[PDB]
Design a binder for this molecule. Structure first.
Ligand SMILES: Nc1ncnc2c1ncn2[C@@H]1O[C@H](COP(=O)(O)CP(=O)(O)OP(=O)(O)O)[C@@H](O)[C@H]1O
Length: 342
RNA sequence: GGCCAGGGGCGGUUCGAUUCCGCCCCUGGCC
C-alpha cells in the first residue's frame, strides 16, 4: 500500500537493485529494498503504522526496517554512499554493477515501470558483470569478490573492461588494503553459494585468494580434489537427502587443507565457522590419514567403529575423496539401511 | 539477517541417552 502513502505525502519511492535483479531473473525474494526521493523514515513509519507493525528507524542513517508477514522491507533515503536532495539516479549510480543498478517504480503515477539508465537490463540479458565506471574497483575492492560471486552464481562473465580493471585492482594490491571484515564476510557469502566451486574457479583465474589468505597458493591436487567433492556432494544430496549440511565449508576445508599459518585455524576463526567445521578441521590431521589407512583392513563390523566419526557427517564425505575406500562407505549408508529395516 | 553461545521447543538417529543432528524461542556477545 506504499504507492498510496507515497502519493498522500507527495513522494516517489522505488524498489532497488538487488531485489530487482532477482525479479527479472524470476526469483522470489523476501528481502526488499526501497529508495525514497524524500524521507524514508516517515514512509516506513506510516507504513507499519497502517499495518500495526513495529518499526526500527535509524536516524542519521536515513533508514528504517519493518516486517509484514515474511516480508522484510528496508526503506532508505536517496544518497551518495555515506547532503541536499539527491535524485534516484544519483543513488543508483553509486551501485555495484549494471544488473544491480536498476529500480522499479512503486509510484501509482507510473507503477510497475522498470528504471534503468546504465543498461542493466541488457547486461542482464547478455549475461554480463559490468561496473558503472573505471574507479569502481578502486572505490571498493570488495566488489572484486562480488563481481566473481555473481559471475559465478549467475554463470555470467565479466565485460572486457571490467575484467581488465578487476585484474588491475588485484595486482594493485587493494585486496590487501580493504577492511578485512568486508572481504571476510563477502567470502562467507560466496561460501554459502550452491555454485560456490565455480566461483572458486574464478578466484583461481584472478589469483584473489593468494592475497586474502596469507599462506595460500593454488595446487592442482586440491583443485581436482574440489571437483571430486563436487561429485560426492551432488549424489549424497540426492540419496542421503534426509540429512544434509552446509557443503560449502567442506570445500573451504580442502582449500585450507595443506594448512598454512600454524594449522591456519586462525582463518576458520575469522570465518564465523560452525562447530562441525572448526571441529572436522582438527580431525583432518589426526585421522584423515589413520582412518583411511587403518580402514584398509576391514571385512565388515569395523564399519561400526568408524560410524562413530559420522557424529558430524562431513568426514564421512571427505573419505570418498580417496577412490580406494569410496564404494566401502557407499555401501555403509545402504548397509545400515538394512539394520533399521531388518 | 551468519555464527559464539547462555537457557526452551516442536520433530528425530539409535535402545535409550538433556552427549547426535532440523529448526524455532529466549539471554548476552562478533560480521
Ligand atoms: N559495495 C557495494 N557496492 C555496490 N552495491 C552494494 C555494495 N554492497 C551492497 N550493495 C547493494 O546492496 C544489496 C545487497 O543486498 P542483498 O539482499 O544481499 C542482495 P544482493 O547482494 O544484491 O543479491 P543476493 O540475493 O544474491 O544476496 C545489493 O542490492 C547491492 O546493489
Amino acid at each position: 500500500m506504499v504507492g498510496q502513502i507515497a502519493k498522500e505525502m507527495g513522494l516517489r519511492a522505488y524498489i532497488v537493485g538487488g531485489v530487482v535483479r532477482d525479479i527479472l531473473l524470476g526469483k522470489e525474494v523476501w528481502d526488499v529494498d526501497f529508495v525514497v526521493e524524500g524521507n524514508a523514515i516517515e514512509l516506513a513509519k506510516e507504513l507499519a503504522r497502517r499495518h500495526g507493525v513495529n518499526v526500527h528507524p535509524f536516524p542519521e542513517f536515513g533508514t528504517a526496517h519493518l516486517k509484514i508477514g515474511k516480508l522484510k522491507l528496508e526503506f532508505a533515503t536517496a544518497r551518495r554512499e555515506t547532503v541536499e536532495p539527491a535524485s534516484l539516479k544519483e543513488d543508483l549510480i553509486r551501485r555495484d554493477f549494471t544488473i544491480n543498478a536498476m529500480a522499479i517504480s512503486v509510484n501509482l503515477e507510473d507503477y510497475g515501470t522498470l528504471i534503468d539508465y546504465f543498461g542493466g537490463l541488457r547486461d542482464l540479458k547478455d549475461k554480463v558483470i559490468r561496473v558503472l565506471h573505471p574507479v569502481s574497483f578502486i572505490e571498493d575492492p570488495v566488489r572484486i569478490l562480488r563481481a566473481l560471486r555473481f559471475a559465478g552464481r549467475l554463470n555470467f562473465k565479466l565485460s572486457r573492461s571490467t575484467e581488465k580493471l578487476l585484474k588491475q585492482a588485484v595486482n594493485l594490491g587493494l585486496l590487501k588494503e580493504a577492511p578485512r571484515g568486508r572481504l571476510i564476510n563477502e567470502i562467507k557469502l560466496a561460501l554459502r553459494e550452491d555454485r560456490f566451486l565455480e566461483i572458486l574457479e574464478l578466484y583461481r583465474k584472478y589469483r584473489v585468494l593468494e592475497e586474502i589468505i596469507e599462506g595460500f597458493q593454488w595446487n592442482e591436487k586440491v583443485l581436482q580434489k574440489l571437483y571430486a567433492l563436487r561429485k560426492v556432494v551432488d549424489w549424497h544430496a540426492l540419496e542421503f537427502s534426509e540429512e544434509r549440511i552446509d557443503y560449502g565449508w567442506l570445500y573451504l576445508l580442502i582449500l585450507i587443507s595443506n594448512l598454512d599459518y600454524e594449522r591456519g585455524k586462525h582463518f576458520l576463526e575469522e570465518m564465523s565457522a560452525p562447530s562441525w567445521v572448526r571441529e572436522t578441521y582438527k580431525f583432518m590431521k589426526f585421522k584423515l590419514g589413520s582412518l583411511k589407512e587403518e580402514l584398509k583392513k576391514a571385512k565388515e563390523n569395523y564399519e561400526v567403529y568408524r560410524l562413530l566419526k559420522p557424529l558430524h557427517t562431513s568426514v564421512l564425505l571427505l573419505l570418498m575423496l580417496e577412490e580406494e575406500l569410496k564404494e566401502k562407505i557407499k555401501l555403509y549408508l545402504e548397509k545400515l539401511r538394512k539394520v533399521k529395516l531388518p
